[PDB]
């Protein structure tokens, strides 16, 4: 039976089912007020598939120069061409390989540059604006969207969407390591998965990601939807409330200094962007410091919102899109104030 929506992280998360639905709002704006994320599934169905895939993109844009980070030990690998990473996404025998002769597990950096996604791909500006979910918070010019309408004592949000293209996370030594490290914004965000590259050549790699999601401390509800196939998983996310980001700083802080890094009592390892809480540090998180957090397995066309000041990190389980629009909801507008 269709239903309007259902919980999963046993009760804490709120799951639509139906993007498109009109009374989707009611049942938002409760858990939304309370500083929760909320996950919408389905997205996919509402886009042009054909609009989203590797090759597609490898076609269109191969010849432009980009950046691209080595996830495993943070390395820039400088000024190459944007095919280079297209054509490896998938196929693993045409990865770009380390000194040690593995293919590297690569994140394409800021790409589209900058505000330039709608300039570049005015096609795929139009098929994603037009379907994101619960669109008075998240278009422009919504109702419930105050980024066109603050003055400058409110930090606002550049202009998106903003493209998050990386392959997945392969090794038992790779638990550890982040696609993107723990930090926080201060506008709110959806961040929609558009599409999920499975590999081959080394496809057979379907059991370190149950390993994963499962060490993840992944609830029941997803691991069944996990563990009867249907939908495909991309990315693990670990979401932490915004009034809880002052005690992981205390938690990063002892740890850096165990660790023999020589920082000012003061510095903020959240917005340092420089730690992945791994099996480990969530555990001594919630023993030492009493703090929980919500453990989200984003699949195929999941919108995951994320609260403004809320601290998280993503670790992708295969070859990931992820698009992302900002917007300042009035829920959530102290956490861009410039005072007090
Ligand atoms: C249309 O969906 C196809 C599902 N592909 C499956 C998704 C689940 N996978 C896992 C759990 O690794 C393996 C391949
Ligand atoms: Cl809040
Ligand atoms: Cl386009
Ligand atoms: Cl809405
Ligand atoms: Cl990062
Ligand atoms: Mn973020």
Redesign the pocket.
């Known amino acids: 039976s269709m239903t309007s929506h259902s919980w999963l992280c046993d009760g804490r998360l709120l799951c639509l089912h139906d993007p498109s639905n009109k009374n989707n709002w009611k049942i938002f704006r409760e858990c939304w007020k309370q500083g929760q994320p909320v996950l919408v599934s389905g997205v996919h169905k509402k886009l042009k598939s054909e609009l989203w895939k590797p090759e597609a993109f490898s076609q269109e844009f191969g010849d432009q120069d980009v950046d691209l980070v080595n996830c495993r030990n943070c390395a820039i690998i400088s000024d190459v061409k944007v095919r280079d990473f297209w054509d490896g996404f998938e196929i693993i025998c045409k990865r770009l390989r380390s000194e040690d002769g593995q293919p590297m597990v690569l994140k394409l950096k800021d790409w589209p540059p900058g505000e330039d996604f709608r300039d570049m791909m005015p096609t795929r500006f139009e098929d994603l604006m037009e379907n994101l979910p619960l669109p008075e918070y998240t278009k422009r010019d919504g109702r419930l969207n105050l980024a066109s309408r603050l003055p400058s004592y409110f930090v606002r949000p550049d202009l998106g969407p903003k493209m998050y293209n990386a392959y997945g996370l392969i090794t038992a030594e790779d638990r550890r390591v982040?696609t993107?490290?723990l930090h926080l914004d201060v506008s709110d965000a959806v961040n929609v998965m558009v599409y999920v590259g499975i590999p081959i050549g080394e496809g057979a790699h379907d059991e370190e990601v149950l390993k994963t999601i499962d060490e993840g401390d992944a609830d029941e509800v997803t691991k069944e939807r996990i563990h009867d196939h249907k939908e495909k998983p991309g990315a693990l996310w670990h979401i932490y409330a915004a009034k809880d980001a002052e005690k992981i700083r205390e938690l990063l802080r002892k740890v850096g200094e165990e660790q023999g890094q020589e920082n000012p009592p003061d510095h903020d390892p959240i917005h340092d962007?420089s730690w992945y809480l791994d099996q480990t540090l969530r555990k001594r998180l919630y023993e030492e410091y009493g703090v929980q957090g919500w453990a989200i397995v984003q699949f195929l066309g999941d919108a995951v919102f994320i609260p403004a000041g809320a601290p998280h990190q993503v670790h992708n389980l295969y070859s990931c899109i992820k698009v992302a629009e900002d917007f300042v909801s009035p829920e959530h507008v102290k956490h861009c104030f410039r005072l007090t």
């Open positions: 982040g993107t490290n962007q």
